[PDB]
Each structure stands twice: as C-alpha cells, then as structure tokens.
Swiss-Prot record, chain A:
Modified sites of kind Phosphothreonine: T61, T106
Family: Belongs to the eukaryotic ribosomal protein eS8 family.
Complex formation: Component of the small ribosomal subunit (SSU). Mature yeast ribosomes consist of a small (40S) and a large (60S) subunit. The 40S small subunit contains 1 molecule of ribosomal RNA (18S rRNA) and 33 different proteins (encoded by 57 genes). The large 60S subunit contains 3 rRNA molecules (25S, 5.8S and 5S rRNA) and 46 different proteins (encoded by 81 genes).
Keywords: Cytoplasm, Phosphoprotein, Ribonucleoprotein, Ribosomal protein
Gene Ontology, cellular component aspect: 90S preribosome; cytosol; cytosolic small ribosomal subunit
Protein name: Small ribosomal subunit protein eS8A
From Swiss-Prot, chain B:
Localization per Swiss-Prot or TrEMBL: Cytoplasm; Nucleus, Nucleolus
Other facts noted in the record for this chain: Present with 106000 molecules/cell in log phase SD medium. There are 2 genes for uS4 in yeast.
Source organism: Saccharomyces cerevisiae (strain ATCC 204508 / S288c)
Stated name of the protein: Small ribosomal subunit protein uS4A
Family: Belongs to the universal ribosomal protein uS4 family.
From Swiss-Prot, chain C:
Biological function: Component of the ribosome, a large ribonucleoprotein complex responsible for the synthesis of proteins in the cell. The small ribosomal subunit (SSU) binds messenger RNAs (mRNAs) and translates the encoded message by selecting cognate aminoacyl-transfer RNA (tRNA) molecules. The large subunit (LSU) contains the ribosomal catalytic site termed the peptidyl transferase center (PTC), which catalyzes the formation of peptide bonds, thereby polymerizing the amino acids delivered by tRNAs into a polypeptide chain.
Gene Ontology CC, one term: cytosol
Miscellaneous comment as given in the Swiss-Prot or TrEMBL entry: There are 2 genes for uS17 in yeast.
Keywords associated with the record: Acetylation, Cytoplasm, Isopeptide bond, Ribonucleoprotein, Ribosomal protein, RNA-binding, rRNA-binding, Ubl conjugation
GO biological process: maturation of SSU-rRNA from tricistronic rRNA transcript (SSU-rRNA, 5.8S rRNA, LSU-rRNA); ribosomal small subunit assembly; translation
Similarity annotation: Belongs to the universal ribosomal protein uS17 family.
Organism: Saccharomyces cerevisiae (strain ATCC 204508 / S288c)
Protein name (Swiss-Prot/TrEMBL): Small ribosomal subunit protein uS17A
Cross-link (Glycyl lysine isopeptide (Lys-Gly) (interchain with G-Cter in ubiquitin)): K12, K43, K53, K54, K76, K93, K102, K130, K138
Gene Ontology terms for molecular function: rRNA binding; structural constituent of ribosome
InterPro entries on file: NA-bd_OB-fold, Ribosomal_uS17, Ribosomal_uS17_arc/euk, Ribosomal_uS17_CS, Ribosomal_uS17_N
Post-translational modification: N-terminally acetylated by acetyltransferase NatA.
From Swiss-Prot, chain D:
Subcellular localization: Cytoplasm
Oligomeric form and interacting partners: Component of the small ribosomal subunit (SSU). Mature yeast ribosomes consist of a small (40S) and a large (60S) subunit. The 40S small subunit contains 1 molecule of ribosomal RNA (18S rRNA) and 33 different proteins (encoded by 57 genes). The large 60S subunit contains 3 rRNA molecules (25S, 5.8S and 5S rRNA) and 46 different proteins (encoded by 81 genes).
PANTHER family xrefs: 30S/40S RIBOSOMAL PROTEIN S4, SMALL RIBOSOMAL SUBUNIT PROTEIN ES4
Keywords recorded for this protein, A-Z: Cytoplasm, Isopeptide bond, Phosphoprotein, Ribonucleoprotein, Ribosomal protein, RNA-binding, rRNA-binding, Ubl conjugation
Pfam family, one: RS4NT
Protein name as annotated: Small ribosomal subunit protein eS4A
Keyword RNA-binding recorded: yes
Source organism of this protein record: Saccharomyces cerevisiae (strain ATCC 204508 / S288c)
Amino acid sequence: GISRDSRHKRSATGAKRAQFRKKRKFELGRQPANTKIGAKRIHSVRTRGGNKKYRALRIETGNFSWASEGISKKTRIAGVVYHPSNNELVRTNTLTKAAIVQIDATPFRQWFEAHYGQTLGKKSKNAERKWAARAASAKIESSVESQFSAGRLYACISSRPGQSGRCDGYILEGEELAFYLRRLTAK
Amino acid sequence: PRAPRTYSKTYSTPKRPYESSRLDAELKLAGEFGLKNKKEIYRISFQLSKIRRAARDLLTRD
Amino acid sequence: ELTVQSERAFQKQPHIFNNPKVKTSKRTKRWYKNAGLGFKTPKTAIEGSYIDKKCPFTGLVSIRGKILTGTVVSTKMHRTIVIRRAYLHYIPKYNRYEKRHKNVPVHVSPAFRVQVGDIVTVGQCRPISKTVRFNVVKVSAA
Amino acid sequence: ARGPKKHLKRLAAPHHWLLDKLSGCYAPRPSAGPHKLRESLPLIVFLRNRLKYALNGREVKAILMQRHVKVDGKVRTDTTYPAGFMDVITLDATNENFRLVYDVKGRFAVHRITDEEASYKLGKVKKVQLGKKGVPYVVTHDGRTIRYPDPNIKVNDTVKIDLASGKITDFIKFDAGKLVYVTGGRNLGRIGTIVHKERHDGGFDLVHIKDSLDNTFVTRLNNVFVIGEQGKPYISLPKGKGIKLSIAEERDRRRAQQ
RNA sequence: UCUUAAGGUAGCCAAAUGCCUCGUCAUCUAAUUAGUGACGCGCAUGAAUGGAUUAACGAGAUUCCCACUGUCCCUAUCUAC
RNA sequence: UAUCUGGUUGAUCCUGCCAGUAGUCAUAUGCUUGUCUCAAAGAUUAAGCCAUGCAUGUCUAAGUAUAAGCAAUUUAUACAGUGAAACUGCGAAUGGCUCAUUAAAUCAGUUAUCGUUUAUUUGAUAGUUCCUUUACUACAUGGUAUAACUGUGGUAAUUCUAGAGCUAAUACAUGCUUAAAAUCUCGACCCUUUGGAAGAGAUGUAUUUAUUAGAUAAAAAAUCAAUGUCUUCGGACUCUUUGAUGAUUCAUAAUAACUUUUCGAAUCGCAUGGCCUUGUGCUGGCGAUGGUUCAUUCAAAUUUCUGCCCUAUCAACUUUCGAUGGUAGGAUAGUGGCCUACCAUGGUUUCAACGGGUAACGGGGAAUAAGGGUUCGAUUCCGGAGAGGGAGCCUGAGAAACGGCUACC
RNA sequence: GUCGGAUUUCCAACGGGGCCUUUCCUUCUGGCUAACCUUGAGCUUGGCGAACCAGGACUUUUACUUUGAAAAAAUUAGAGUGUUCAAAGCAGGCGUAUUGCUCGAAUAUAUUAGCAUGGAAUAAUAGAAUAGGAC
RNA sequence: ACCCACUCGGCACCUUACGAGAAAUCAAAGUCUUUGGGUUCUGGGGGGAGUAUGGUCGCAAGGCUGAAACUUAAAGGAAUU
RNA sequence: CGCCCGUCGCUAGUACCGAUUGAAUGGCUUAGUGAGGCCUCAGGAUCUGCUUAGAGAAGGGGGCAACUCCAUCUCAGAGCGGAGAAUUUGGACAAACUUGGUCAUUUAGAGGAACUAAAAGUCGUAACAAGGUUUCCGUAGGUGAACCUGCGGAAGGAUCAUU
RNA sequence: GAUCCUUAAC
C-alpha cells in the first residue's frame, strides 16, 4: 500500500507540505518480490490497463548469455555472490539486477567442448573443416580457461525479476569481471 | 448547469439627488412631454451618456 | 576523478560492451550523441573516462523544452550545481520593477570544469533527481 | 477525475458550432472519432441547426439509424459522430454531397460538391513511419493510415484518396510556391500560398504565406493544409475562397443586399 | 481635638503570630477541623525587638500527585537463633 | 459620466476627522406589493444530524430460452413473434451537489513526455497456432458445474439464502483445421582438399538477456593466415544504404536463447444464383464481438517558466534517523529520495527562508465610470477536492469510489 | 480636367527602401545561372554559388520597445435584427407566395509570463596591460 | 600688524517677494496641480496609551518594540478685535 | 463673578492580571498498543483427467464338465495430478488510545488593579496674565491631591536690545 | 506677602 508521490515529502527548502489529497490509485506502489532460489513460482498481478506483471519468487532456472557470442542458454543458478548496493541481499540470496552470481554453466561447458573441443587441465570431415574455418581463436586468455575449468561462472543478472519473472543475465567478460573479482578478493 | 440570462440596468440616477435647477428641468421636461415618472428621463440620460462615452472613446483617435 | 571505479558497482554505459577478442585501433569505444541546438561536445568529453549516466552527451538523457542560463552560485555537490536566474518582476500598480531571483538546480557533467562566478547555460530534460530538471550544455567562462 | 468526461454542456462547446444558450443546457459531445474534439463537427448539430433537415435530436438519431446519411462513403451510425475537416458526406436521397470545409469566418459552413469531388478526398500526412514487418506507412490528419506510400512523400504533404481504396491516388509535395489552406486560430479559413519558411529548431516552426491579394501573414506548420498548386485548387472552395475580407466592406454589402 | 510623644507608613496575614474559628470565598476530594490561593477594623502582624521577597541548600515542619509496595482488605508460608 | 456641503470659533484661515452623498451578479428587515418577459433562491452560523419518498441501468433482425405466460405453422417439423425471469457484455468512475482541507499547494497562461495505456472510436495489420511435426487431428469441429421451476423452511429480521434433479457457454481449461522463395544446424562420399548432398527440424508478433545494423562530404600502391560477390580473373564491383526533426541505445529489421505460452469465429440475425458422375455434395453477401497490434481522437499521470493575500509580537530553517546530491536496487504504466542500502554534506533564506493567520478552493469574472486604482469572486463556465474523520482494497481500461466493500471513532 | 463627384509627364515632409566620401554590411561545398564577358541576322553552345533552400558553424549578454499565434465561451464596446422599443436572444429577408432563393451569428483588451521578429537610442556586464592579444 | 579690492570655505544678520505658506513667517519652509534630481526615517481625528501582552536589553530605575476592547465631535495650528 | 486640575465619594461598561501542577478542541511530535485491508514463508477442509491387479465370473470360443483375455454389479493398494474455502509465520499501508512538549485557538475562575462615561459632591487651586514661585522637558526623591524640590536642558518667555 | 473660591451649558 506504499505511495510514490512527492506530495508527501518535504519541500526543497524544508517546508512541510499539508495534506491536500488522499492517496490516489496512479501513485500506488507495491511490495518487492524478494525472489529466492528453489522451486520456481510466478505470480501474475494485474496493473494499470491490464498489463499483467510476473513477480519472480523462489525462481530457480533462468537464461544466461555469453557476451562475445550473442549465444544464450537456459541454465540453473547456484546463488548470488555479490550485489552492489547491499551485503544483506548477498547473505539472504535474493535475485536483483546488476547482482553477480555463480552458475554451474555446464551447458556452456559442453557447448564449448562440442564447438571447438579444446580440453582443459593438464572426427568427421565436416567437423574438421568447421574447426579449420573457426580455428586460431581458442587462445583468448587464461582467466576464462580457469573459470571454465573450475566450473562456476560469474554472471550478472540484468533483467528485473520483479516485473517479468525472469532472472535473465549475461556473463562477466573483461573489465566488469576483473572489477568484481578484485572487489570480492579485496580484503 | 443552465447558461445565465444576461440583464442590465437602463437608468443611472444622478449623484446629486436634490438640486433646484436639475429637479425643475427634469420635472418640466416630463410634464411637457407627458411623462409620469422620472424613470424615462433617467434611462434616456443613461443611454445618452453611453453614446457620449462612445463618441469620446471614438474621437480620441485620429 | 583519479579513479573512475570508486563505486561498489561497475559504472558502464548501458548496452555497450567492447569485444576484447579483436585487437583494433582505439580498442576502447565510447558512445555520445548530439544534443543539438548548436552546442558541441567538449573535446575532453570526447576521450574522457567518466560515465555520468545522466550526461546530455554520453548519458541517456535528452534535452527538450526550455533553454535557460545563469551564474553558478554553489558547486560543492556532485555532478550538479545550482544557478541564480536574476530577473525583474513588474508591478503594474507602481509602474516599476523589483529584483527577484530563482535558484534552479541543474546537472553538470564532469566534462565542464564549473565554478562559482562562472556563466552556464542549461536545458530542460527528464526529471533527473528530486529537484534537478536541467543539465548544463555550455560554459561561457574562460 | 476517476475517468473520462462523457458529457458536455453549453458555454463550453467550440465557437464554430454556434449553439443558442437557451433551448438546451447541454452541448452534443463528439464521440471518439477521426478528428479532435474541438476542431471537428458532429452530425447532430449539422442536421438540426446547420441544415434543418431534421428539426429534433430524436429525428436525427432516427434518420442516422435508418441508413440515409453516410460519411466518407460509410454510414457511421453514431449519434454524435465527429466529422472532421475536409470530410465528405454523401446523402444518397436527393443526392446531397456535402464537404466539411472551413469558411472564411472560421466556422464549418455548407459546401456543395459534385459527384467527382464527393467521391475523392485530400489529406495532410501527419507522420511517415514504418510499422510491423518493416512496411512503410503514413498517418494523415484524420488519423487514417495508408500503407505502401511512395518514398518521395514526406511530412506535411498532401495525399489524394479515391474512396474506393486506401491507396493514394496522387501526391502533393510541400515546397516553396504552393497553395495552402490554414485551419485554426485567427488565420482559420484562409488560403496562403507558402513562399518561404525558417527552421528554428526546438519547436513551433512558423511559415510566411502571401495569398492571391498579396496579403502576407505568418502561421505555424500544424495550422496550414497544402491543398494544391498555383491557380487551380485540388478541391472546390466555398464562396469567398479564403480571403479574409477587410472588416470595412460587409456593411456596404449588407446595405446593398439587405 | 484628648490622652502619656507619635498614632501602624511600606509591606504581610486565620501566617510557626487570629480569641471568636472547623472565619468567608475559590480550588483540591465522592466526602477535607488538613493544603493552597484570595479577603482582612488584624483578640494580639509590621519594618536591623528588622518588614517583604528570594535562587541554591536542608537526616527541619506540612499538603497533593506519579511510582512502589503485606500499611491495610486478610492473612498465609519459609529460613536461622 | 475629473462635483462636493454641514459640524471646532465672537467671527477668520487651516490641518483634521466626524457626518452627509451616490452605487453594489452583497445580504437582511420593515412599510408596501396588479401584470410582459425574467430568474438568483439553506453562502456565511452547522462540510450538523436526518423521519419519509426518488435519483443507474441496459439490448437489437443479430450473446444465451422449454416456464406448463400471450398469440398463430394452410410458409419452416428442432424452436425460430413478444417474451416475464436468470446467466454473460458495457456501464454504474458519467451526471449533479458542496467548498471542508488547501498560501509555489491548487490554479491561469506556457511548455514536454526522446519519461508514460490503447476495449472503448477510426484505417490498416497474421496461407509461419503442419509445434515427438506425414495415421497422434473429428474439421462440415471435442468437454465440466449452475441460476427459474419442484419443497415439508425461517424470524421484529436483510437486495439472506445450502446440500437434491437436468438446462446455455462469449463462465472456463484444449489444439489440427487453406504452399513456399530464401537461410542455419543435423545428417551416405568422391580417398583427399574450386566443395558438398538425400532427407529432418527451426524462421509472425505478445516479456526478457546479450550481439548487430541503422554516419555516401574532394583524394593514389603494394604481402596480408584466407581472393567477399562472378569471372575476360591486369578483378569490372557498379546497383554497397533502411528513413524524418535538434540528435538518440529512435523506428525498424537481423543473430543465439526466451514463455512457465499472450496470442489469430470450436460465435449470433438475415439469402439460398448457378456446377454437376441426383451428394444432409461443389459455392457464394449484409450487420456486433476479442485477437498481434500499428498508428487518430475521448483522456490521465508526471512535468519546464512565471505568477498568490495578511503577518518579524516568526531569522534562521531543513538530516523520525531523507534533508541536498551521487551509485546500485526495488516499486510504479512510466523518470524521480517515490522507497532501501552505501557515500559526501549539502539545500533554502533579509530578493523574507521556515513559522503563524486566512470570517482563503483558484481562474475566466463582478461592482469605479477621468486616468491610476480598491474590494470580493462559495455560485450557472473551466481546473481541483470531498461524500461523517482519517486508513485499506477488489472489480474495472479508467475509483483509493462511498446511491462498492473492509475495519476503528 | 470625364457619360452632390476627384487622376496626375512638378514645386511640400517624407512611415520608408538602397550605395558612397577610412562605415570590414559575417564560411566552403550548388544549383535552372545574378545586376546574364555569351550578340549566330539588333528563344542564340563558357563573370564572383547561401536574393529562396541541405552539411562544417561565428547565434558572447540583457533590460526595453515594434510585430505575429495565446489567456478558452457567456461576461465588454459593439456590425445588423417590428423578441410591438426592447432589456434580452440570434435571428431573419426576398418570391414564380402551388414548387423556391439568400445575407447572416465578425474585430480589440487577448489578467502576469515563455515563443520566434525589425530597432538599438536609454543603464550595466564583456573584451588587449608584468599581452598565453587578432589576423 | 593694519588699509583697499577679489576669491574659496564657514557661524550668522537687513529688505522687499522671484516664489512659498493657513498664517506666524521662510534664500529656504523657493524652483510642488505648469505635480517626477537621489535616498532614509516618521504620521493618518482626540483619547484609552507609550498602557496590556509577548519579546528584547538593564543590577535596578527603566530603555527599545508595541496593540486591542472601549470611549468621544471635536481636540488642535496661525491671526482678529 | 472665566476657564480649568487631581485625589477622594455614587452607578454602569470595557479590557487586563489571577491560585486553580485550570479545562476543551486542533495540530505536529519521542517511546508504546494496535483493528482491518495487502504481499508473503506455511497449511490443508473440499472438487476428478489418465493408466492397475485380488475379485463370485457371467456371455460368447478350442473338449462343450474342470483347462482361458473383454467393458465390468466393488473396495485400505501407485503416481503425474490440477483447482483449493478455513487457519497461520514474516513483512509493509497503517484507521483508533496513553505517557512529554513545538505550539494554534476557544473558554471557566475567588479575587486584584486600571480605564472610560454618567445636571447642580467634597477637599484644595496646579496650569491658562510675570496665573500671583514664568512655563515646559528628561531624571531622582518626597507628597491627601493637584503637586513641590534637586540637577541639567528649552523658549513654545516676561529679554530678538549695552562698542 | 497673604488679592483662596464662584448654584450649570445655551
């Protein structure tokens, strides 16, 4: 039943405004999703002019995309590891935009193995020609190799689970990934 | 709801109420033109003053 | 200023990610737009490392409506400053004027180096903050 | 106010309708239609005060139901259908071909057109765009849209519709030296013959127009309506041809033909 | 004017000073010989036999209130000696 | 319609007020009071409370009928005319009343949404609903309860009603119902490198992620790891573009994934010309509806600029612990301290901030008639607001609704 | 001067519009070619492009004043009107009076302020001074 | 140090009225109905009343700010005999 | 033989102060309580769409007498189930009641002290003339009362005047 | 140097 009008707030100088209107419909807000992990459940809430809103709550499996490939796969998420506004959100494992999370991303692991086949650690002519065409690009760098070998990928959720019920996201690649890993290890 | 119906007054009374010269002039005019009350002379004076105001606001320009 | 990433979050222009896979000249890419109406983006804003998601040139805001101008009166609060619009209110009873003024708070991008006693021009835009509704588009001082 | 206003009273209706204050404490509210609430003419006042073809609102609604009055070739069984500028009304009985065109006094007055002009129509293209499936289309002043337009046509041009299909019969480009019709304001009901214009980026471009009497005034872009080239208009004009006669002449005209 | 010289001025008061007297009025209470504020022909107030007031202080005297309670309704039980 | 006179003195000239004078979309009261138009009329005090009666319901040829209601087939054999009732649909958020709160609030003018809905209306917009994809599909088309009526029931009592019997689904879950051009992944080999093909699936928008495109201004040569189009192969390369305003991460198409699937007659009234291998076959128009929507009106929210009465016996105010700004997030139809977390200390003010008063709703307006001005404007129009006081909410596109509910007083 | 009416092969002041005596009155790309060097016999093949229009910009400031949309409709002055004058309110009039025809319902303040627009007189700000000053 | 003249700046004096004013009078109290050089302060009939209250300064006396209820037709200025 | 001042006498009216740790109403506000609607972790009355064996074994087959699938006149037995009224953890909007006060008003109050206005009151004459001590101002003291006196000031003085 | 006062205005 919260409100979103400015008529309840103090003036820029500090003048206390009087009560001129009762709370109105267009200035309503409603309680946050605080979506969690486990046993997906989606609630549909009817808003101004129909416009059904899907409130994520305990959503488990989302969709996540690679940056350089434009390639997205559905995958489960292990749970949030950082959130830029709060640490209590990190602790209670809620999903919000611009939060970095760990994902198993074995869909991406098998995807890379089936696409290029360069193993970590330590046959058909069509596939040989395909690899010859798309070769000389699997020596990008070492951080992505280490992340893939560990098997827990750092992906930032960028959608709003409290509107569309989708913890859709993009993996961290390059500058943002370096920033967040430095942040988590900075102690 | 309804549109108001516009009315207006037709006579403006003289500011000085009792002076011999004006009182006798209006009385003689009414009596010799066969009028019963001063409403006629007041209303025609109001109209004549309206016309003279129009003429003044007209001739004040080139 | 010294550090761009002092924030907890990663400040980046939305929907702009630069592919490191290739190695091309000027590997960093930055996005900007012409606010129009004759104002030109500073050549220092051309290569600057700031983000200012509300900037009229690099951010996502757009300028439309009223173009105002005034002298900055205080510059102690971040990415935004307030100016004095000193005008004369006419009093038809006494046929004379009187000096009134309004402090309109507006937004300054890090591209411009503003100060008190400097003259700036601002443009009406989408509500940026509780009070801010303008961004500076040009500085007339030197 | 908890929802749209559905009524409309006298003293609030637009001036170009000219309703007497008495004989009704409400003013026919135009419905949702093809043209704005103000700069449009509902059929009820046209048929009760502008024509006297039906002397009462019940009668007008009856004749509007029983399919004797059709607008734009379509019957439009709406008791207060808002008929817009340069719209065509075809009354099959008695062959009454009306054009809803602004007179020189700034009102909608009866205008007689023949079969050809009651058949065809003009329109100001309001915005060129491309919609679903990448189809180019344009939206005109009546809100009517047409798809697949010639890419030559741009904003603030004229398009001619044959009334058999939404396809554009002919196009009129907006450029220097073109006869224009201005609808709105104090210039309402005038022919302008645009000559030169200025941009003034930011909004509200104004254009200088000098008519066939070499009288030159200025009006905004949304107010004018380019109707044809020099000389022959692409629609017939009601008496006057949009000239704004000097106020000093109609008294002589009335004293002659009075 | 008389008596012994002057005749109680500022103040203050049923005051630790008032007989009558549990004075009269107001307030506090359900109810008040109590308290406080007023009144004052004050048995018998009163100006360094100091008058009036006064913040702070007080194991000084008095009234009301909040808190608290076996003071009481109305007693009961327990420990040591 | 630029007007003054009486009163201070024994008399005078003055200041000065008192009084007189005239008018009120300013009331009231008294004396009085026949009509032609003519109309204000519980406004001040009491936005106090109400006995009683009414003010929102509604349908066509065309959403659903069997009441055992009315009437008749010389034209339908299953009604097809009204149709009381009841279920669905759209309202009832319009209108009207009052002026309580309200002093940068509202409001007037001016701006903007490049920051935000689309049934209502208008024009147009799905041969991609073959979705374990060639015997799982019936496409001249599959299902589940139920309101009148039937009853032995109710009280000072409700616009109260439950279990029994079948009825209609546009009440609600389902999916096939009318081809591709072209592209990517699957998937036999010439034994080899100028390269694949039989056949399979995928390509509409409705939500989201990530990547693209969406800049032709005058200008010349050479290896590139691999010629990009097709061949005279000293490469001609032309047609490389899809577009406006001040420009956009605009519109818009494209790439890999998205849907727990949001979608595209499983409807009603009106004709029946012709093709025949004479079949409950082959065809075909006029009217409402949701659909992806695109865009136009009816709008609503937020909104830039300026402007509001009397007060200093209100001078400093603003941070419950958001006050100013920033980052990130959530919520909203949307931007935004609208709300949360973190950071710095800011923001307004003698050009009157903050506070108090308002017998203060604002404007278009009314009254003066020299000019200038003064006072009011609840109220016939517009913009707000409220339905006894705040608070909350369902439904609905649109109510914090009161002739709608949920509580307290 | 022409079958109660008025045009001018000049003497008055000029709202005004141009160029000149130091008055420098502001881009490069462009146009059917501009005041056109084209002249074939006095529709005829070659001056400096923004007098109108597209991209690079130099719009440094005001106040003021003159314009042009805008403060909605009644309400204001008012055009017109045998609502008998009328206040009002928009009518109504002309006939072939059995069929028909037609003028009408405009203009100013548009209560402050923003928007483009000619001027720049009246009061400031601004320039180049131990020259990082302009070409 | 005096005398004569000139000048600047002063404290001031005589006459008319150029003017002003109700007059007394005034070289300013003039250049103000032929009304505008700049600017500050104060007043709006006589009382109640410089009172009450709230502030504020003072040791106090008091100072500064400063009402209203109510009452009244005059109170006042300058001159005439 | 004019006017005129103040104190004390009588009547009325007006406001002011005032014990009552006064009262009421209205904000706004620290710490508390808190209906109800709302989102939510839980909760499960109550409604069936699909398949199965253990059945007396009908009625129909190969002998016609035992040896055998079929829908079934049934029930503690397996899931995918999907709708779900009660109730209930956490959380927000948050109506109504206390304890303190910014503060805004309205109002009761024993008494006190003023002011104003009432035909001929008393006591004295303070000012108006040099008003009989010129008057006035500020300040301080005194005093039945006007008022008197000290100090400084003013002329609005009773002097525009002593080369 | 006592010469203090004058039933109430018109």
